[PDB]
Design a protein around this ligand. Structure first.
Ligand code: NAP
Ligand code: MMV
Ligand code: CA
Length: 159
């Protein structure tokens, strides 16, 4: 089993504000879709609710949602009550897709983090997990989106 985390953050670590992602980055959406397609995706209940209805559930991927309500019913997805239960229901290579609470829950089990860093001085109430010792990453050139925002992809792997 290989657990991955995937997220997009500002340079300062912000990932969400008022239940949404406070920027638009189409190159990141395309990358996220390509990376996770065909894999189990694990998310917190608030992230399930932040999904636009047209992509809820995320198509072509088994959706798993963590909640403490044993009778929460995400149509087209599986609701589970614990990290162990989510992994027991996962395929061999699940991606943890947020949000802040769920990233911190699965980080100790993760083997890679696919991170998009965005150049945006925007505040928020949800933060990316802190990567301490144990990870190695190669830097990539910063890119400019058609939306005009500058962004960087980073692929962290466990040492
Ligand atoms: N930038 C990115 O890449 C990215 C990606 C995804 C989301 N986000 C943003 O992040 C924000 C959401 O993050 P968040 O931390 O607020 O919410 P979250 O982690 O997505 O969901 C939190 C919820 O998950 C459930 N949960 C948490 N710990 C649990 C546990 N141990 N066992 C079972 N269920 C558990 C609870 O649901 P119940 O209340 O139902 O019990 C809790 O309220 C949004 O603003 C979203 O836009 C950003
Ligand atoms: C694209 C946002 C995003 N980007 C990265 N790098 N990691 C995430 N965990 C993430 O969040 C996933 C949850 C929200 O996903 C969306 C939010 C708005 C529109 C579309 C999608 C996903 C679309 C798809 O994957 O088909
Ligand atoms: Ca129903």
């Amino acid at each position: 089993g290989t657990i991955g985390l995937i997220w997009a953050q500002t340079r300062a670590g912000v990932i969400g504000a008022d239940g949404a992602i406070p920027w638009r980055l189409p190159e990141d959406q395309a990358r996220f879709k390509r990376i996770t397609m065909g894999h189990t995706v694990i998310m917190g209940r608030k992230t399930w609710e932040s999904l636009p209805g047209s992509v809820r559930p995320l198509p072509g991927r088994p959706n798993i949602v963590l909640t403490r309500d044993a009778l929460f019913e995400p149509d087209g997805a599986l609701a589970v009550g614990s990290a162990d239960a989510a992994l027991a229901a996962s395929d061999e290579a699940p991606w943890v897709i947020g949000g802040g609470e769920i990233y911190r829950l699965f980080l100790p089990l993760a083997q890679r983090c696919e991170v998009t860093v965005v150049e945006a001085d925007v505040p928020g109430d949800a933060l990316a997990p802190e990567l301490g010792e144990g990870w190695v990453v190669e830097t990539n050139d910063w890119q400019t989106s058609e939306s005009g925002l500058r962004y960087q992809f980073l692929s962290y792997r466990k040492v």
